[PDB]
Amino acid sequence: TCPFYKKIPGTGFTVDAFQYGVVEGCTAYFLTHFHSDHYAGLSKHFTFPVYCSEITGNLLKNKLHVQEQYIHPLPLDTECIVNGVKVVLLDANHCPGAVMILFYLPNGTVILHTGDFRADPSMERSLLADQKVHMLYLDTTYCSPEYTFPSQQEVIRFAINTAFEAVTLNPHALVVCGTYSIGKEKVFLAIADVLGSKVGMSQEKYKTLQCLNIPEINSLITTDMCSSLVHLLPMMQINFKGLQSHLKKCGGKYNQILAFRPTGWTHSNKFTRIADVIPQTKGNISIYGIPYSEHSSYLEMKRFVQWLKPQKIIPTVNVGTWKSRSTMEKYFREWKLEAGY
Ligand code: NI
């Protein structure tokens, strides 16, 4: 049964709640972004409206095969009426096509649902700057002060450096990048750009990328593996046995892989900086982990909430145990007492 933090009061609206069957009274099912925990349940056989971004729509039509009529894409940053309720979609700074949703209730209540987000100061000069938000449904993935990690522009620096080094030292080395969902495209696009290459990938991953409205995408990517020296691979595959396997397939065209596993937080963030990173090494294969996050750090989250001064906060992540719920409330109370709301 749909949990209360997936419903919007005073509406027929639900958010990311596609895995319960029909939801009694739900006229509309919102989807914040194309990640399988949030979309779990959608298919070709859905015959209720789905509101989402244009990009999320393309993924719905082409990857899940939902029928065009039931996909209502909406522009971002545009005041839109939906069953006689004003709503706005705002960029979530998560993956491609990921949005937050502003709901303007008839009664005067304003609600913000963040979806998955990486909070940023540019969100403080958006349409949110113009009015008061009473309820906040918040991505709490990293709501604990241990969770620090670098900026995305810092990570893209390291990456561009490491790869452009090794390839200039050894011009017969391959760059590999791990992946298992949309997100983090900047990692491989930036490396390929510094190397003068296209990124090569499976057909299914090519298909996914062709849905994302990336400008000039036809010049950046290929299904011809042979022609490319930045390859993508399933994240499951990014290990020694699997990289050996893959290094066989390229047929004596490269003599060294240099891989990147973009990850979120891991416990080695607590002790080691990004400039002082190293890889595991079993022969000529070298696997880097790099903490490129598309979720708010604790400090980023804290700042966004303290600016927003919401009257109430409803977590959407780590809500499954009383211990986590309890820890989170304590942080929300501190933030409130510091900031005076
Ligand atoms: Ni996500």
Swiss-Prot record:
Tissue/organ expression: Expressed in brain, heart, kidney, liver, pancreas, placenta and skeletal muscle.
Mutation effect (H295A): Impaired nuclear focus formation, reduced interaction with PIAS and increased sensitivity to cisplatin
Subcellular localization(s) per the UniProt record: Nucleus
Superkingdom of origin: Eukaryota
Induction entry: During mitosis. The mRNA encoding this protein contains an internal ribosome entry site (IRES) in its 5'-UTR. This 5'-UTR generally suppresses translation while specifically promoting expression during mitosis, when cap-dependent translation may be impaired.
Known partners and oligomeric status: Binds constitutively to TP53BP1. Binds CDC27, which is itself a component of the anaphase promoting complex (APC). Binds PIAS1.
Function: May be required for DNA interstrand cross-link repair. Also required for checkpoint mediated cell cycle arrest in early prophase in response to mitotic spindle poisons. Possesses beta-lactamase activity, catalyzing the hydrolysis of penicillin G and nitrocefin. Exhibits no activity towards other beta-lactam antibiotic classes including cephalosporins (cefotaxime) and carbapenems (imipenem).
Homology family: Belongs to the DNA repair metallo-beta-lactamase (DRMBL) family.
Protein name: DNA cross-link repair 1A protein
Organism for this UniProt entry: Homo sapiens
Taxonomic path: Eukaryota, Metazoa, Chordata, Craniata, Vertebrata
Gene behind the chain: DCLRE1A
Location of this fragment in the whole protein: 700 to 1040 of 1040
